[PDB]
């Protein structure tokens, strides 16, 4: 069965750039909700029931079809905000390979946070930004709802290996920025935990 | 050009059901953009930018390519927002005809509330229920993001006259209600105006 991960810091260790509260509601409720409901859709398909949530998210068109949205959604959310609490730290920097790959890619470290700033403002209604691998290389896009690059373009209309994400759905955001997203992109970037998406850079799968 | 229509009432008049810090944010922030967005894009299109805005979405097929994401979201947008503020009211009571499509359709006042409540908490992401009249036959939608019945199956998954419609994205209730939309849900009942609604029965078109 699926579990809510254990956070690796307190519901505050973001602060001053994310709010505590927002973080404790997100985790404890949103988070806990996706868990709870995916659970309840496995619970007849004991097939799929077990496999690590980001197989499973790969394998939906497996799923008998009146199965497929619900698990889509909350496998996917499942599998999104576990990756995107590993993936905040504050004190981190953006420094070897990962580096100087993004350099290479959007030319420059600022162009790449411009490109990314971009692609999380314009995400209409509720989605993830990405920065994803794909052959090689670096990757700027973004997702609607749930969906991840990690589901395949069919379904997402994205693809590529996800390094780090950032949630725009407004409960990430609301209670703090209210309609200022772009105020709280910018504040993602003193959040986004460098080493963590190194890691993943380096593994590449 | 479309104009931003001011709000039949003061920000707290909705008090103590909606809260009034949203009201504000929601229509002098969030409606705001959407006027100023599809204004934008109409610049280019006198043919298109004389119509009603709940005219414009029913040609969204008609627009040029470029143009049809950007308007379908934001020529939605105020759509949808200039209905919502017009069909939200305290002390109304739902009598008279507004009974007369029903129990072919629903059974009773409760049932309705209840396919109605399901389909707003079931939106998955940002998005709209809503009370529609489809020729002869009221019947409970919901869509995606600004998309609204106007813009036809095709295009959102819905179609009918709308009679009166709850705003789902999170902007709407996050303030006061954060993740517990069904307690917003329920609050919606004690300000939807069934005044407004009955008067759009009358609409039919
Ligand atoms: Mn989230
Ligand atoms: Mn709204």
Known sequence: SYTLPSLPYAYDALEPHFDKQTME??????????????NAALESLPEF???????????????????????????????????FWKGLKK?????????????????????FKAEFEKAAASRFGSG??????????????????????LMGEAISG????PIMGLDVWEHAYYLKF????????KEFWNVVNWDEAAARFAAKK
Do not use: C, M
């Open 25 to 38: 509601i997100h985790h404890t409720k949103h988070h806990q909700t996706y868990v709870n409901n995916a």
């Open 49 to 83: 029931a077990n496999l690590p949530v980001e197989e499973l998210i790969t394998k939906l068109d497996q799923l008998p079809a009146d199965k497929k949205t619900v698990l889509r959604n909350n496998a996917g959310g499942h599998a999104n905000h576990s990756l």
């Open 91 to 111: 004190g981190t920097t953006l420094q070897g390979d990962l580096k100087a790959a993004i350099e290479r890619d959007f030319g420059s470290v600022d162009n």
């Open 128 to 149: 993830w930004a990405w920065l994803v691998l794909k052959g090689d290389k670096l990757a700027v896009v973004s997702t609607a709802n749930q969906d991840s690059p």
């Open 158 to 161: 994205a693809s590529g290996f």
């Open 178 to 185: 209210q309609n200022r997203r772009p105020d709280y992109i």
